[PDB]
Structures are given as structure tokens and as C-alpha cells.
Specification:
This is part of a larger assembly, with two copies of chain A.
Chain A lengths: L1 H8 L3 E6 L2 E6 L10 E8 L2 E9 L7 E5 L10 E11 L10 E13 L15 E2 L3 E6 L2 E6 L5 E6 L2 E2 L1 E7 L7 H4 L9 H8 L5 E4 L11 E11 L2 E12 L5 E9 L8 E8 L5 E8 L12 E8 L15 E10 L2 E12 L3 H6 L12 E9 L14 E9 L1
Antiparallel strand pairs in A: 1-2, 2-5, 3-4, 3-6, 6-7, 8-9, 9-10, 10-11, 11-12, 13-18, 14-15, 15-16, 16-17, 17-24, 18-23, 19-20, 19-21, 21-22, 22-23, 22-24
Chain lengths: 397, 196
């Protein structure tokens, strides 16, 4: 996967956008771009709207201005995107016909989301019990354990959906950079995390549990993760299931300053559904990270579940897709603006297992939808190379 | 122009919940959308969570926060945060975090050309008269409205408006300062607690 990012970052053609025209500059110094053909496309939240091809004729170290046609200006809500791709139509001594040499993207005019009425007409009588809060809307049921403060099980009719309760994950598997030269290096990031006890922090349940409203049921909870008595993180969640079945979860997370920065902020679980493909609208199709999202392209991507995990010999945190405004996997769908990875292996198994060939496919599917995540670094592999946060997620089907 | 919406909620077990949103549009194009949530408990503490989204195509908004004009006119302003002199996100280096108390006159700096001033960032707790606001924000307090500051070209022409003006902002851009002939400087959320 790193090859694609290197290819994108090493392209010979840099692009600048000025209104409608496009400025194309060639880094070649002796040769003319006589074997290139630009392909520009317009997409509104994934669906293409307009496209065209402009052959490239730019002198070495020169500039070429490409005047686009009258681009569409739809009134539909969303973000318009301009994707330009330079393609070599003729096969060279080292390439095939239609070779892609460079591509770049820009954000065009964005129309703020307009209509989105939540709920229809359903005051849900959440079954208040001592051990859990049970909420039922037709064939759909959600269970909220009152002793752990986490979503235990959700129902689509009869079949179960969650093999692991929805919990927050502050940790990611060992990273070569984090490891540095540890096996113990005090400045290693994973060693600092272990010393802070983030991997062994225990969630302590609290309360704030709320009740139903006019057309929905409101759940408000908070937890305290403490390692040997010191509170590392505190997060306050808010769960909102409307009459249409859409579940909105707002989580606000605070972090102690003295502790090292947490690896990730987001939710983790193990779904019972095992689908053959993963569909999302966001940066892709290959995996990406906050510090390595440059090569990632915003578009509606669909990949098989096998492609969702990269075959690194040393297992670690991988398969991450950032900037995902909408996710699709089986019957469920999550919307918003987040980053996620989906795989059949848990982070615990990734940490424990040293070789890829020793990895075993766990039951169901593992999901880690994270609001935020640090970069992976990469300046060097023997030293580090990389307070209050909130994320909003919408769960639908 | 702010266009009102709904989402208005109702009371809970020990409190009353209000949820609203507005749309600010200029000639039909929605510039910003913010969804607020107001929470008054049984102790009188009012918690206001506001989540703000901004259109990408529009230029970055100057500030995100709440504005009003209090009836109370107190002689001093007390806060715990960066100070005691005014500070800005790009010029908070000299600011020192401590419990500062200053008279209301010191809350406004006598720049001859009136503009946005008196800002105190990193204020975890604010005190002014009977009210008090806590959290993590930036604010300025003065007797002159931003409209009067924009309209008035000289300081000596400024007139003290009735009451006191407050602009508690969750976020604010820097002021720049590299040069004076060119610029030198999407989705946000703030939590405030109102008490007395």
C-alpha cells in the first residue's frame, strides 16, 4: 500500500486551481508531455456529474492553463469535488497503454446539508429494568447494560448483531515507530502508553442515565478509566434513537494532560454480520492515515473484506480508512465524518501475533470507528516520529 | 440573517431540555448552521452545548461564540485564565494562566481606532457581578458593542452603551500582524456552563 502513496507524492505534475481554470506545471526538464491526456471529473458526494479530457502540451519547467467548461452548480446539499487524472494513453518502454501518471483533487462549492427530519411519530416506552435499558422500535431492539454502561446487544428481528458490546478504544496495536528500539526504551511510544496503563485502563461505569422525550429515548452516560487510581480519560456519551431507527451517539472525551496522548478516540465492537464487501464514501480506496492521507481520494469506494486488511507480515493496526462521511457494511450504515478500519482480527490478536501467517480469523467482524487518531510517523524506526475531544456518529440501517 | 428552526425538546427527570438550530443565509446561500442544546438543572446551572458547521466555500468565520448585553454593570471583572492583559490565539504567548481580577475600564484597551479588543483567551472560569461561567473559552467584556466599534473611527467618539456587552467565544482566528496591507492570519462545538 505504501507504493501508491509514494507514487502520488512523487508525481511529475503539480496542479493549482484558480476558479475555473487549472494551472498545470511539469517537473520534466528536457522532455515535452507528448504522451499525456488529462481526465477531469466532477462528483457530488460520490456520484459523477460532469467530466472531460484535455490533452496536455506543456514545455519542460513550463506552465499550462486548462480552461474548464461551465461546471455544474447543483442545488443539492453536499460537497462538489474536482478530480483530475493525468493518463498516458500510449504504452511506453516501461508502462502499458492508459498508464496513470498523476492525479489531484480539490473541494468545490459545498451546499450545506438541508432537509434531514429525524423520527416520524413514535414515543418509545423504553423497558426500564434494573439490569439493562431495553428500547424496542418495531423489529429493531437495542439493549443498554446498566452495570457496564455500554451497548450490549442490538436486534434486527431475532438475529443478534453485536458479538462484542460497543466500547471505546483508546489503544492501537504496536507500531514500528512507537516501538523504536524497544523489546525497554523509555521514550518509545508504546512503552510510554504501557507505563501510563492505557492498555490496562479499566472503565468504571457512572450514571447521568436520562429517559424518553417526545418522540425518542435519551440515554446519557459517562465512564472513568483509571490505571492504579489515576483517572486517565473521562468521556460522556449521549445516545439518541429516533422514531425512524436512526441512532445518534455524541461522545465528548477529555484527557489528562500529564498522561501521554491516547492512541485513538473512537468506538470498538465485533459485529455478528460477515459481509463479502465494504462500501464507503470517503478517502480511499487504499488504506490511509491522518499523516498519510495525501494519496487518499474522496469517492464512493467498495472493496471486498479481504482488501480491508493489508497483508503486513508483522500484524499491527492497519486497514484504516479516514475521512469516511458514510459507511456501508451489510445491513447497517454509519454517517458523519470519521475514520475507521474493518477486519476479522481483533487488536488484541494483532498485538499478540508476531507473524501474519499465524493470524486466525475471529468470528464475526471487528469494527473500530474512531473520531480521531494520531499519525504513524515514519521519519525513523528507533525513536518517536509522530486534551478534550468530541465526535458525532449516526447509526442507521 | 438567522432563520429559526425547531427540534425544541421538553423536560427530563430533574431538568428541562431545549434543543434548537438556526440557519444563517446571505442571499439564499446557507453560510453557517449551528445546533444548540440548553440544560438547566435543579441547582440553576445552565449548560449550553452548541455544535457549529460552516460551508467550505465561504471564507472562514471571524468568531464562533455567543453575544449579549447584560443589564448588570459591575466595577470589576474576575476570571481564572490567561492574563491579566488582553491576549489572542496567535498572541497568547505573553498571557499567564492565573486568577486575575481587573476593573471594567481595564477590560477595554484605549486604541484610538476602535476595533475588536479586550479579548481574554483560555478563561476556564469567569466572574462578573452575580453570574459566573465555567469551561474553557475566550471572551471580551466592554461597554461598547461591536457595531459601534465598527462604525466609530476615533476612540474619543465612542460612547458608553447601557449595561455591559459580553462576547463569550469558543473559537477565534488569529489577528496576524506580518503586514498591514495583505492578509496575515469547518465543524466546531463548544460547551459552556452558566451559574450564579
Amino acid at each position: 500500500p505504501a507504493l501508491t502513496e509514494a507514487k502520488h507524492q512523487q508525481q511529475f505534475f503539480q496542479f493549482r486551481l484558480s476558479g475555473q481554470t487549472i494551472e498545470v506545471t511539469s517537473e520534466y526538464l528536457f522532455r515535452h508531455s507528448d504522451n499525456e491526456l488529462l481526465h477531469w471529473m466532477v462528483a457530488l458526494d460520490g456520484k459523477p456529474l460532469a467530466s472531460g479530457e484535455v490533452p496536455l502540451d506543456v514545455a519542460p519547467q513550463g506552465k499550462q492553463l486548462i480552461e474548464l467548461p461551465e461546471l455544474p452548480q447543483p442545488e443539492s446539499a453536499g460537497q462538489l469535488w474536482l478530480t483530475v487524472r493525468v493518463v498516458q494513453p500510449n504504452a511506453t518502454a516501461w508502462s502499458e497503454a492508459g498508464h496513470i501518471s498523476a492525479w489531484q483533487q480539490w473541494r468545490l462549492a459545498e451546499n450545506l446539508s438541508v432537509t434531514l427530519p429525524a423520527a416520524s411519530h413514535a414515543i418509545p416506552h423504553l423497558t426500564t429494568s434494573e439490569m439493562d435499558f431495553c428500547i424496542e422500535l418495531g423489529n429493531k431492539r437495542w439493549q443498554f447494560n446498566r452495570q457496564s454502561g455500554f451497548l450490549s446487544q442490538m436486534w434486527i428481528g431475532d438475529k443478534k448483531q453485536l458479538l462484542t458490546p460497543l466500547r471505546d478504544q483508546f489503544t492501537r496495536a504496536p507500531l514500528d515507530n512507537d516501538i523504536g528500539v524497544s523489546e525497554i526504551d523509555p521514550n518509545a511510544w508504546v512503552e510510554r502508553w504501557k507505563a501510563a496503563g492505557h492498555y490496562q485502563a479499566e472503565a468504571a461505569l457512572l450514571q447521568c442515565t436520562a429517559d424518553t422525550l417526545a418522540d425518542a429515548v435519551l440515554i446519557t452516560t459517562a465512564h472513568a478509566w483509571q490505571h492504579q487510581g489515576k483517572t486517565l480519560f473521562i468521556s460522556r456519551k449521549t445516545y439518541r434513537i429516533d422514531g425512524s431507527g436512526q441512532m445518534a451517539i455524541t461522545v465528548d472525551v477529555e484527557v489528562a494532560s500529564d498522561t501521554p496522548h491516547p492512541a485513538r478516540i473512537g468506538l470498538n465492537c465485533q459485529l455478528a454480520q460477515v459481509a463479502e464487501r465494504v462500501n464507503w464514501l470517503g478517502l480511499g480506496p487504499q488504506e490511509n492515515y491522518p499523516d498519510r492521507l495525501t494519496a487518499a481520494c474522496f469517492d464512493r469506494w467498495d472493496l471486498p473484506l479481504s482488501d480491508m486488511y493489508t497483508p503486513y507480515v508483522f500484524p499491527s493496526e492497519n486497514g484504516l480508512r479516514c475521512g469516511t462521511r458514510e459507511l456501508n457494511y451489510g445491513p447497517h450504515q454509519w454517517r458523519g465524518d470519521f475514520q475507521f478500519n474493518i477486519s476479522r482480527y481483533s487488536q488484541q490478536q494483532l498485538m499478540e501475533t508476531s507473524h501474519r501467517h499465524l493470524l486466525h480469523a475471529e468470528e464475526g467482524t471487528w469494527l473500530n470507528i474512531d473520531g480521531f487518531h494520531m499519525g504513524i510517523g515514519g521519519d525513523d524506526s528507533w525513536s518517536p516520529s509522530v486534551g478534550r475531544y468530541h465526535y458525532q456518529l449516526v447509526w442507521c440501517q
